[PDB]
Symmetry: C4
Subunit: 102 residues, 4 copies
């Protein structure tokens, strides 16, 4: 029953596009890229890898998960600084869409 | 003894509405669902669930609690992206309403 | 060595005033109240109470600290929704004020 | 393995400048001083210190690292309010500069 969320959520209001919710596109590369890195370098599972990635722009909250290696530390910074912007506007957009969707 | 805040804040500032504080309603809907899932899925108590729900889109931080199921992990992930926007705007309007009460 | 931050920072650009930074007043009262609550309920030392209270407006991160009692859990959500906006507007004001000093 | 992000990230969007990204300069100062503090006060390594400093101004999330002494606790609070702004606009300018680069 996580249906009503995924379907009346990420799927449904993710298809409200201006020229400037090409930020979603921008987001997806970056999150995905981070996830790959986390999986490979930090050795974590895909979900956990994704969880960490999502965490560094959003108030969600990383898990037990934190970087243990120098590359993972440094990388987390550089990614984090960028994506924080990206997460924001997208969240705003979706929020906006939700309200005029009822 | 939080009787001060609940009357002076939480049930103070909501009694003030524009068009865009339709956002409250959506946020309410999001949170409730989230909490329910947590209680059912993640087995935690109503508040612990409820706390966790709030934790994900505001910066406060979750202490001990973190999702342990892949299913709940994705639920957070999906749910995270929707609610944050809502949190932002309710956060802002609500804050402004304090300021216009002094 | 914090003196350089404290004087060159949260007072040096704190005293940059319009009418609309009356939120600083509000921030002070609200942060104070929460701190008091934390001190009382959570048993915590005043600094720690203060630490936690600020942790929840800002992207900070609490320490190892988090609400362990039900009232504290309940209180935190309520407070966080209120105070976040305050933290935001003040932050922007203060931010803008560093930049205006170059 | 992060060479994509380092060169095509927070060195690419740097060579894209108006004058109100003097905020990057501000952030560098505040961040650097913070790092200096944390290394010294809290005994941590430089990388860890940097991470922690970043962690208080972004949704990133402090790992194990958090302050343990009053001096550092207070300092975080002070710094936290200051940096929160500078981070935010940095993310924003940076963020837009990604979409303007596509
Ligand atoms: Ca986070
Ligand atoms: Ca926080
Ligand atoms: Ca955290």
């Amino acid at each position: 029953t996580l249906m009503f969320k995924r379907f009346f959520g990420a799927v449904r209001t993710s298809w409200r596009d201006p020229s400037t919710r090409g930020a979603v596109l921008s987001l997806a590369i970056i999150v995905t890229a981070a996830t790959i890195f986390y999986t490979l370098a930090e050795k974590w599972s895909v979900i956990d890898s994704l969880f960490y990635a999502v965490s560094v722009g959003l108030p969600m909250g990383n898990g037990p998960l934190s970087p243990t290696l120098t590359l993972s530390k440094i990388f987390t910074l550089v990614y984090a600084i960028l994506v924080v912007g990206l997460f924001v506007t997208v969240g705003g957009s979706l929020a906006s869409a939700i309200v005029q969707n009822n």
